[PDB]
């Protein structure tokens, strides 16, 4: 209105978070599909 | 000197790039470790 009084807003930094989040599941899919379609034997 | 050049400068953005590679890290020793903590049995 007048002067400068912060508000619901988010910084830069914030890109981590999500980036992060993001990446997370995605290497969680890699992973999980390659123990899948790769093959496992029984070693004691 | 006179007018704005461009130069060797990171954006903000990039902050993703490093909380991403940052976290992946942490998060492999996690779930290796628990791997190897972690008992296993033989389960056809």
Same mark, same amino acid.
Request: with cysteine; proline share 7%.
């Given at each position: 209105?007048?002067?400068?009084?912060?508000?619901?807003?988010?910084?830069?930094?914030?890109?981590?978070? =999500?980036? /992060? *989040?993001?990446?997370? $599941? =995605?290497? /969680? *899919?890699?992973?999980? $599909?390659?123990?899948?379609?790769?093959?496992?034997?029984?070693?004691?």
């Amino acid at each position: 209105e007048g002067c400068p009084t912060n508000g619901p807003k988010i910084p830069s930094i914030a890109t981590g978070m =999500v980036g /992060a *989040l993001l990446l997370l $599941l =995605v290497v /969680a *899919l890699g992973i999980g $599909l390659f123990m899948r379609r790769r093959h496992i034997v029984r070693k004691r």
